Amino acid sequence: ASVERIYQKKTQLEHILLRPDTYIGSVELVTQQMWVYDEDVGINYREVTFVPGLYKIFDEILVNAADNKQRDPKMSCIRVTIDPENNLISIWNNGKGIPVVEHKVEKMYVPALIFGQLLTSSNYDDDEKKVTGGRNGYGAKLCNIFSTKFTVETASREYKKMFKQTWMDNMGRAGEMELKPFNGEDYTCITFQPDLSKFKMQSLDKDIVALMVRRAYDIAGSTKDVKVFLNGNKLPVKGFRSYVDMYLKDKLDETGNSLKVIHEQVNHRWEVCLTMSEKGFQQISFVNSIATSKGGRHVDYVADQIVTKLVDVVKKKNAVKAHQVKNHMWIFVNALIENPTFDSQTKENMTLQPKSFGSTCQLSEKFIKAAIGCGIVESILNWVKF
Amino acid sequence: ASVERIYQKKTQLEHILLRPDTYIGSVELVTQQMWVYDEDVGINYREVTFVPGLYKIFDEILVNAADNKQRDPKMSCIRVTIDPENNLISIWNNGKGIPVVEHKVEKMYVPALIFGQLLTSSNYDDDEKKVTGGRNGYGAKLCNIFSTKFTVETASREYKKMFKQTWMDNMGRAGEMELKPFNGEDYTCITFQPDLSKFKMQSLDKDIVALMVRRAYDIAGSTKDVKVFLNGNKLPVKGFRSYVDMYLKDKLDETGNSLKVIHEQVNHRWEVCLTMSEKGFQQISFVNSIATSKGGRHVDYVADQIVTKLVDVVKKKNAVKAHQVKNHMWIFVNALIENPTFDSQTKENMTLQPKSFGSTCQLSEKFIKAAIGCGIVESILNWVK
Ligand SMILES: Nc1ncnc2c1ncn2[C@@H]1O[C@H](COP(=O)(O)OP(=O)(O)NP(=O)(O)O)[C@@H](O)[C@H]1O
Ligand SMILES: Nc1ncnc2c1ncn2[C@@H]1O[C@H](COP(=O)(O)OP(=O)(O)NP(=O)(O)O)[C@@H](O)[C@H]1O
Ligand SMILES: CCCc1cc(=O)oc2c(C(=O)N3CCCc4ccccc43)c(OCCO)ccc12
Ligand SMILES: CCCc1cc(=O)oc2c(C(=O)N3CCCc4ccccc43)c(OCCO)ccc12
Ligand SMILES: [Cl-]
Ligand SMILES: [Cl-]
Ligand SMILES: [Mg+2]
Ligand SMILES: [Mg+2]
């Protein structure tokens, strides 16, 4: 019971491994209903058992790839490989690579700096209003820390060089840096073997693969002008509306009627789909291709427009409250937000106030008119009649 | 557009001030309905405008004081002072002080280590199953980083010394360490001036004071055997049940009947109150005296017991879903959880699975039967019909 045993100081790396929850989410098993992509079945809603932290280190690299489309509009493809037997995940993107040159301040090559050193980012200057998902300078290093092997390969024609270096043992050591002359099409490829012992797992089982695959479909549905491949197979997704259809296709309410779906691409930064829900308020949303599974002010900003307008209709007739109207809604929101803020590194809840979004999302009078007639008002009027 | 301007590395301290959101919450104004204690009406539900990050650095020090009751059960009092004119907040507790001695490993005095160095804590050894709120070793340093002046004073009789040192300019520099002989009642007092420029605030206005005051009432209601004083005024709270009453005050539902309250202190680590909600599912919960404003598995663990039993009854008299039963519930939970986990440093959502709680909270059949007899089952049986 000595003072030095009671009061302890931890390094940054030690703290991440000792307290992973605020960095990557829970490292313990979770059992809950999720949307997944099952082989031969597609998008479906079922109970899944998985470790959030493992899902998240995959997500960090995948979002980083999508971020490059904002950095370089010439980027066109993301290629994802998932090899459960060899415990191997690879994420590849074209467009401009990372500059392969020595950082004059930190005195090391840039790819080694931003992948092997904590708190390193190109998103630290918020005078630039960016719609990338990267914000904090942790993501890629967290995947590195929770991998037994983590390899960065990036090629920059501008610098006429290609970079390749491997980290091992939870970013505890690095292999040899490979520099080669390069004069081809730029690319970046991140290949890592997740440290499954950190997650009390033995392999990338059916459930986590089904989640990682559905996440690849998310990227295909949330980005623009980006082809997404999964294990060499192109994913058949064209726009957010076709992605949303994969959830609603052939769904029926309890009475037997097909779900009425209201859609509007409000502008180049907002796309909204609205249908009816029988299990309370449901939302599926994305901010800068991040799956905001706890929602955020972008979801409230869209849903509160619909709720207030629907409440005004029930008030002409018939005492109703907004939460009663909201529990009949299932909304899909794909948004591009400038310099978003979140509650945590996992970025599941987007906290930025609408006045700082950098854009607006006023639903058309056509959308609202289609929403007053989607049966939500009918399901509220029959309740007041009781 | 040079490489060194594009790709930058930040120190831990720089990152906290540059990206405060994951550390303390939003540093921008928020307008939402909150429970506050106003100087003329008391506990009431109204719209408030405040900066979460400023509220949180107050919460970090306040929860630290409550943690000391777990460290030293002989501790009995917390005294909080809020002086808006001089921008001065102090949080004082009795019980055992911090050991005043040089840390043999980090080579500095213990209070200077755990208040002036990031990632320093007594809660890093999870072989000890503790029910304190502190987990990550950030809290006090974050308040320090977001203050223009931050002073730590703690007196340890065991070491017969008293410690006092001041940090200034967002923990950018530290004053002189003052060591004096001590032989009185142990205490710890944290006094800080919040850096209102970091929060774009001109003063500690009515709304942020009302929030800080209600939080002191939370501590008085969530802890055991702790008197809480605010500006020399004792808070009249004795136990969790009396605290919950301050919210309901015999107020009436939409029909005009007084709200029926079902209560059970299941054991020494769980106390639950259940009434009726007319605005959807409401929860007011605490884990190790932390206000878990986003809920967590401690709330699900309690609420789902009620939901499962109420669903079992409506099926006997008949298609029902769990969310419809839950949207009529307003639940209060005061829980002590071993080594809890949360989504973020703000600890608003408690993520630990029930199998790691260190205790159980199985509601008595009397409590369940008392829940079967509220209007929740009645308001649902007629709807399915
Ligand atoms: N696929 C990629 N192509 C090009 N640059 C990349 C790629 N992935 C990462 N980077 C760069 O590497 C930096 C570090 O990535 P990362 O550690 O994820 O931090 P971040 O994305 O900026 N912020 P965050 O993910 O919120 O912690 C990024 O800021 C980019 O500049
Ligand atoms: N009022 C107090 N009385 C006694 N010890 C205290 C007091 N406040 C803080 N401490 C000690 O100082 C340490 C540092 O506090 P803090 O920075 O808040 O980290 P923490 O409470 O351990 N975890 P967290 O608050 O979740 O980041 C605590 O672990 C306690 O051991
Ligand atoms: C700890 C994991 C957090 C998470 C990540 C994720 O990736 O997905 C999730 C989904 C989900 O499967 N989806 C579908 C597509 C992407 C998305 C954005 C927002 C909300 C939900 C979802 C979900 O489902 C709840 C029932 O609906 C619940 C949670 C998640
Ligand atoms: C960013 C601020 C987070 C927060 C801190 C806090 O301190 O309070 C809150 C309350 C609140 O006022 N209370 C009452 C007492 C303590 C508590 C525990 C859990 C939940 C809620 C609350 C609240 O209200 C929601 C509508 O009810 C909503 C949020 C908070
Ligand atoms: Cl978040
Ligand atoms: Cl949290
Ligand atoms: Mg990133
Ligand atoms: Mg603390």
Residue numbers in the entry:
A (entry chain A): 28 to 345, 350 to 417
B (entry chain B): 28 to 345, 350 to 416
Give the exact sentences the study uses for this entry:
We co-crystallized the ATPase domains of TOP2A and TOP2B with 5c and the non-hydrolysable ATP analogue AMPPNP to identify the 5c binding site using X-ray crystallography. Compound 5c is clearly visible in a composite omit map in a binding site that is over 15 Å away from the nucleotide and dexrazoxane binding sites. 5c occupies the same binding pocket in both TOP2A and TOP2B, located at the nexus between the GHKL ATPase, transducer, and the 22 amino acid eukaryotic specific β-hairpin. Compound 5c consists of a substituted chromene core connected to a tetrahydroquinoline moiety via a non-planar amide linker. The chromene ring is buttressed between a Ser/Thr of the transducer domain and Met of the β-hairpin. The tetrahydroquinoline is accommodated within a hydrophobic pocket of the transducer domain. Most of the residues interacting with the core of 5c are similar between the two isoforms (R241, M61 and W62 for TOP2A; R257, M77 and W78 for TOP2B); however, subtle differences including a slight shift in conformation of 5c in TOP2A relative to TOP2B are likely associated with the non-conserved S320/T336 residues and a shift in the orientation of a GHKL Tyr residue (Y82/Y98) that extrudes from the top of this binding pocket. Interestingly, 5c induces a slight shift in Y72 of TOP2A compared to apo TOP2A due to packing of this non-conserved residue against the hydroxyethyl group, while the equivalent C88 residue in TOP2B is located 4.7 Å away and does not interact with 5c. The distance of 15 Å between the compound 5c and AMPPNP nucleotide binding sites suggests that 5c acts via an allosteric mechanism rather than as an ATP–competitive inhibitor. When bound to this site, 5c acts as an obstacle that would block the conformational change associated with ATP hydrolysis, which provides a mechanistic basis for TOP2 inhibition.
